[PDB]
Amino acid sequence: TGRPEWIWLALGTALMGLGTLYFLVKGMGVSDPDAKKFYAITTLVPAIAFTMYLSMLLGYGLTMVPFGGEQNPIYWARYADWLFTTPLLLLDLALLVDADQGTILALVGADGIMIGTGLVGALTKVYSYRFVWWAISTAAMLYILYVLFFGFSMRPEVASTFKVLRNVTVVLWSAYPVVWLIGSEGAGIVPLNIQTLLFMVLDVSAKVGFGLILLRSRAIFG
Amino acid sequence: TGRPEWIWLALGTALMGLGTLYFLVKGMGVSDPDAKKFYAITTLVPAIAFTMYLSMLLGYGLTMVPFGGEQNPIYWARYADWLFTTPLLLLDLALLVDADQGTILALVGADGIMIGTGLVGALTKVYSYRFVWWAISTAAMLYILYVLFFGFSMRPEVASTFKVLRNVTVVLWSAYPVVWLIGSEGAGIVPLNIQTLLFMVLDVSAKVGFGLILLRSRAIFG
Amino acid sequence: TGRPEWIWLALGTALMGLGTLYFLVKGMGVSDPDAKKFYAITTLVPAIAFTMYLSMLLGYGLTMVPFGGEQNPIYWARYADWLFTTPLLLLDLALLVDADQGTILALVGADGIMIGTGLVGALTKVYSYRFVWWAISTAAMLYILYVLFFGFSMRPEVASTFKVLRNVTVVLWSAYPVVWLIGSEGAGIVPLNIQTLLFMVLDVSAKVGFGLILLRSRAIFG
Ligand SMILES: CC(C)CCCCCCCCCCCC[C@@H](C)CCCCCCCC(C)C
Ligand SMILES: CC(C)CCCCCCCCCCCC[C@@H](C)CCCCCCCC(C)C
Numbered sequence: 150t151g152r153p154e155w156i157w158l159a160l161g162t163a164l165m166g167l168g169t170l171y172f173l174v175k176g177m178g179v180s181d182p183d184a185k186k187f188y189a190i191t192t193l194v195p196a197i198a199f200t201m202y203l204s205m206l207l208g209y210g211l212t213m214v215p216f217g218g219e220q221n222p223i224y225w226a227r228y229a230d231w232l233f234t235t236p237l238l239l240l241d242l243a244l245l246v247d248a249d250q251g252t253i254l255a256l257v258g259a260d261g262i263m264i265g266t267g268l269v270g271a272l273t274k275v276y277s278y279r280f281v282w283w284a285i286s287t288a289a290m291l292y293i294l295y296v297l298f299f300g301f302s303m304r305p306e307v308a309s310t311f312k313v314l315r316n317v318t319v320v321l322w323s324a325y326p327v328v329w330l331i332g333s334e335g336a337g338i339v340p341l342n343i344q345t346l347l348f349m350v351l352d353v354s355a356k357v358g359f360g361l362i363l364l365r366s367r368a369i370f371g
Numbered sequence: 372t373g374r375p376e377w378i379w380l381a382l383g384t385a386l387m388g389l390g391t392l393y394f395l396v397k398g399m400g401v402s403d404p405d406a407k408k409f410y411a412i413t414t415l416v417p418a419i420a421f422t423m424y425l426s427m428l429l430g431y432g433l434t435m436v437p438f439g440g441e442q443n444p445i446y447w448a449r450y451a452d453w454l455f456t457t458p459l460l461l462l463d464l465a466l467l468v469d470a471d472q473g474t475i476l477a478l479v480g481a482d483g484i485m486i487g488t489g490l491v492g493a494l495t496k497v498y499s500y501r502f503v504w505w506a507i508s509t510a511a512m513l514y515i516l517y518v519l520f521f522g523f524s525m526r527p528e529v530a531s532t533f534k535v536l537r538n539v540t541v542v543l544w545s546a547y548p549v550v551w552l553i554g555s556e557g558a559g560i561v562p563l564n565i566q567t568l569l570f571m572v573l574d575v576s577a578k579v580g581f582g583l584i585l586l587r588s589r590a591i592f593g
Numbered sequence: 594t595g596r597p598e599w600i601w602l603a604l605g606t607a608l609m610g611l612g613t614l615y616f617l618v619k620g621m622g623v624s625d626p627d628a629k630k631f632y633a634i635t636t637l638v639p640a641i642a643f644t645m646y647l648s649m650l651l652g653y654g655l656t657m658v659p660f661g662g663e664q665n666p667i668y669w670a671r672y673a674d675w676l677f678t679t680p681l682l683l684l685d686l687a688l689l690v691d692a693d694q695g696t697i698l699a700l701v702g703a704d705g706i707m708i709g710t711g712l713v714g715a716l717t718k719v720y721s722y723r724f725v726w727w728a729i730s731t732a733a734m735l736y737i738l739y740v741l742f743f744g745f746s747m748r749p750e751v752a753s754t755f756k757v758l759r760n761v762t763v764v765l766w767s768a769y770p771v772v773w774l775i776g777s778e779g780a781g782i783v784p785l786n787i788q789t790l791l792f793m794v795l796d797v798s799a800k801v802g803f804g805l806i807l808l809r810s811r812a813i814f815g
């Protein structure tokens with residue numbers, strides 16, 4: 150449309166759809182329950198992102214938030230996406246290393262707080278307070294990153310793939326608060342179309358690229 | 372009230388309440404954890420539907436969606452219902468056959484996508500796009516139906532009851548996209564009061580009738 | 594601010610933050626998976642409440658509901674809080690006594706209905722109907738309380754601590770429908786600032802005081 154960010158929403162929709170179908174079909178012929186768990190998780194993530202990208206593309210997942218005086222376009226739908234897909238991603242990680250249930254609950258819960266406070270910050274109409282929600286969310290994120298590094302005798306195939314995904318995770322997820330901060334969501338240094346670009350590249354890498362790495366490894370098979 | 376569909380919301384409220392109390396009391400005197408699981412799931416479903424029917428009845432779960440120019444009455448509350456009650460129903464099925472966790476996650480996730488895209492379609496103000504959400508939702512549904520048929524040495528009592536519920540499920544759930552499509556939610560061929568009627572008959576059959584069948588079987592006992 | 598209830602939202606924010614950090618740090622040095630489960634659950638609860646208190650404090654989690662003619666301030670954010678934190682609290686209880694999965698689902702589900710109907714009642718614009726939602730919610734509550742008392746050979750350390758928390762639970766949770774009923778949410782007998790006070794004292798006691806009791810016991814260690 151007339152939304153210059155449309156092309157990135159379009160590309161994101163397509164690439165999340167294609168990764169969904171790739172992983173869906175790829176997961177055809179899997180019988181191992183454990184592999185089945187990662188296929189389910191890992192196919193669902195871009196499946197959900199596909200729907201939320203499409204909802205952004207079609208304009209459904211977009212709202213206007215008054216702040217700085219202005220009517221600030223906020224694609225709220227990506228938080229609906231992340232609300233489900235980031236814990237699923239963490240679940241992929243958590244299951245890989247067979248985390249304790251307490252640790253998984255800590256991660257999912259901290260994740261829900263990260264996304265929920267990010268959404269609150271995204272929709273907050275007092276500009277200064279946006280960054281307060283950003284900060285708390287970032288602290289939840291740093292908590293999660295902490296746990297992924299200092300809280301986790303697995304088979305070497307698990308380890309190796311975990312350590313790759315874990316590095317992928319930390320590098321990509323850490324970029325999101327920066328994009329939010331510098332983008333139209335936060336301080337407005339970088340335009341919406343570029344923030345949308347950045348998040349789409351991160352999301353495809355964090356969802357499809359992550360899943361390609363994961364669904365490639367024998368780590369997912371018992 | 373003046374809502375001609377009220378009587379069906381009224382009847383649905385009553386019948387979901389009565390089925391809730393029937394299953395609640397019926398489940399009094401159950402000690403087997405497994406039976407306890409199906410009683411919990413199966414009582415919760417019409418309990419939730421009771422609340423959402425009442426919310427529709429009282430007008431709370433109703434909104435107006437602009438499309439075709441018009442202010443289209445949309446009872447959004449039934450999606451809040453379904454969001455919780457359809458995965459629970461699938462969980463009843465999944466537990467019956469002791470599904471793999473991956474398969475359950477696939478079902479619940481596909482279900483959330485079915486309902487969430489149905490809700491997005493229901494609230495979408497671009498009329499043509501409504502049916503795009505319908506189509507994706509329908510594809511999630513067909514995925515679920517696929518899985519219920521081609522993805523599931525259980526005791527013959529499990530099998531038999533599973534196969535009955537599974538047929539009940541497929542026939543009733545398949546009717547909902549058709550009702551949505553032809554009803555005021557979709558193409559508007561059939562009035563809101565008749566769509567509300569149709570969904571109430573399906574919902575009572577899919578919740579109370581389903582639960583009667585299930586809570587009747589010894590399949591639910593270990 | 595000019596919201597006389599601000600001080601209580603401020604105090605609640607602070608005390609939930611401080612309890613979050615206390616339990617977070619306190620939980621440093623825990624390795625027992627079971628203890629890890631209660632630390633996770635129990636730290637998350639005031640962590641979530643911290644965010645929702647702050648959201649109330651900052652004015653984000655506040656809406657106006659027309660009823661009696663008036664624009665009635667409703668802090669909806671505490672229902673978002675409770676939606677997650679009350680099942681977690683019940684989960685703390687449920688895990689303590691190793692409840693059956695069916696019973697946990699019954700509790701969480703009844704809880705979701707309690708909070709969801711309380712939120713519906715809170716946002717309902719027909720004043721009389723508010724108390725209908727109150728009544729149903731109260732019945733869900735009484736169901737939960739029923740289950741906590743008549744539905745649960747645990748080690749004596751479990752029992753004892755369970756029985757204390759269970760009494761804490763019943764006494765504190767029972768006060769909330771009364772506060773809602775007499776407060777600005779319900780019949781308006783007691784002002785918003787006092788209802789906010791009352792709920793803050795209950796919430797801190799039910800979250801931090803509860804968690805102090807729990808995270809003090811050896812009941813949480815296998
Ligand atoms: C087996 C594979 C590679 C899967 C292909 C199926 C569908 C597409 C997904 C694969 C694409 C990219 C891999 C993930 C990493 C990323 C950095 C993607 C960034 C996307 C940018 C838009 C267009 C660029 C492309 C060259 C993919
Ligand atoms: C043991 C039983 C049958 C349960 C009775 C408790 C409460 C009511 C539920 C039972 C009713 C119906 C069975 C489910 C199937 C359906 C097709 C119901 C359609 C409902 C239509 C409205 C009025 C019709 C009735 C004759 C029930």
Ligand SMILES: CC(C)CCCCCCCCCCCC[C@@H](C)CCCCCCCC(C)C
Nearest residue numbers: 604608611612615793794797798801802803805
């Ligand atoms: C080890 C302990 C006690 C924890 C301290 C960390 C942070 C604060 C939480 C402890 C405070 C209170 C215990 C819970 C019980 C309550 C009745 C609290 C009611 C709060 C009222 C506001 C100010 C009062 C205080 C004296 C705490």
Ligand SMILES: *C/C=C(C)/C=C/C=C(C)/C=C/C1=C(C)CCCC1(C)C
Nearest residue numbers: 267283286287290322325326329355
């Ligand atoms: C699938 C998409 C992924 C993996 C998205 C990850 C997003 C995050 C790690 C976002 C974190 C944010 C913060 C730490 C603070 C500001 C708000 C967020 C939500 C952008």
Ligand SMILES: *C/C=C(C)/C=C/C=C(C)/C=C/C1=C(C)CCCC1(C)C
Nearest residue numbers: 489505508509512544547548551577
């Ligand atoms: C308890 C009620 C039940 C079992 C409801 C089931 C509803 C569905 C199977 C609905 C499916 C739909 C589609 C496939 C597309 C259009 C939207 C829906 C949500 C009506």
Ligand SMILES: *C/C=C(C)/C=C/C=C(C)/C=C/C1=C(C)CCCC1(C)C
Nearest residue numbers: 711727730731734766769770773799
């Ligand atoms: C953390 C906060 C806690 C433990 C809150 C508990 C709240 C309840 C037990 C609330 C119950 C209510 C009813 C029974 C009816 C009216 C509405 C509620 C939600 C206040």
